[PDB]
Amino acid sequence: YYSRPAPRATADGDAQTKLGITAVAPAQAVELRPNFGETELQAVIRATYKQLFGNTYILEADRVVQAESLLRNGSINVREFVRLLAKSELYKERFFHCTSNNRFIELTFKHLLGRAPYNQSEFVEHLDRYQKSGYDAEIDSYIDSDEYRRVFGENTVPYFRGFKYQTGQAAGVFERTLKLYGGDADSDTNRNRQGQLRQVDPQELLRSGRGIV
């Protein structure tokens, strides 16, 4: 009696595999170590490029050789490597110049922290930041922020934190990130028909609190 196939009889994996989030859910974390083999280096590099650029395809010409060398000497940590990629023509061309600032913020949020944006205020602090100071100062505020430091603070490639309960999460990340992720073959792409557009609808943000400012 206490052992009997339940009538639902869904597997453990089932719930993830049905959504297509099976790889990202408890994502694996890639760390660069104090002395690195030639393969660890090349894993880290592949993982960064895949996560920052959103599984969009980076050719052989697109790669940035210098940043990778500095990463090989030990002269920059992985966290610095991430900033160099993020502050780069190639990133800016894909997720910044073609989209709207509302679209970019949600992208960078996803790229540099696997979650989607928790609420409407997150858009206010990051849009005003951008008018006051550069793009660059904005990008820094992400890597500089404590949440980036607290998880994957140094020598760890950023990984999706969405799709798993994180402390101080808002509800309705889960759904929001599902709008952003959309499967292992999907990729956000500057160059698709109808351009680069926000998936996260603006009314669901307000659904989480909206204070004054």
Residues 92-111 that bind ligand CYC (CB under 6 A): none
How many residues in the shown chain lie near ligand CYC by CB under 6 A? 14
Any contact of residue 171 with ligand CYC (CB under 6 A)?
yes
Which residue, 74 or 209, is less far from ligand CYC as judged by CB? 209
> Which residues on neighbouring strands pair with residue 31, listed in sequence order?
156
Q: Cβ 142 to ligand CYC, closest distance in Å?
A: 20
* Per-residue CA distances from 162 to 98, 109, 115, 120, 201 (Å): 25, 11, 4, 18, 18
| Residue 191 binds ligand CYC, judged by CB under 6 A | yes
The C-alpha R_g of the chain, in whole angstroms, comes to 19
Dihedral pair phi/psi, residue 31, rounded to 5°: -120, 140
Fill in the per-residue mask, 10 to 49: x = in contact with another protein (CB under 8 A), - = not in contact.
Answer: xxxxxx-xxxx-xx----x-xx-xxx-xxxx-xx--xx--
Residue 127: which H helix or E strand, with range? helix 121-132
Element (H, E) at 26: none
Interacting stretch for another protein, rule CB under 8 A, among 85-93, 99-107, 137-145, 179-187?
179-187
Measure the CA–CA gap between 52 and 196, rounded to whole angstroms: 16
- Contact positions toward ligand CYC, by CB under 6 A? 15, 55-57, 164-165, 169, 171, 174, 184-185, 187, 189, 191
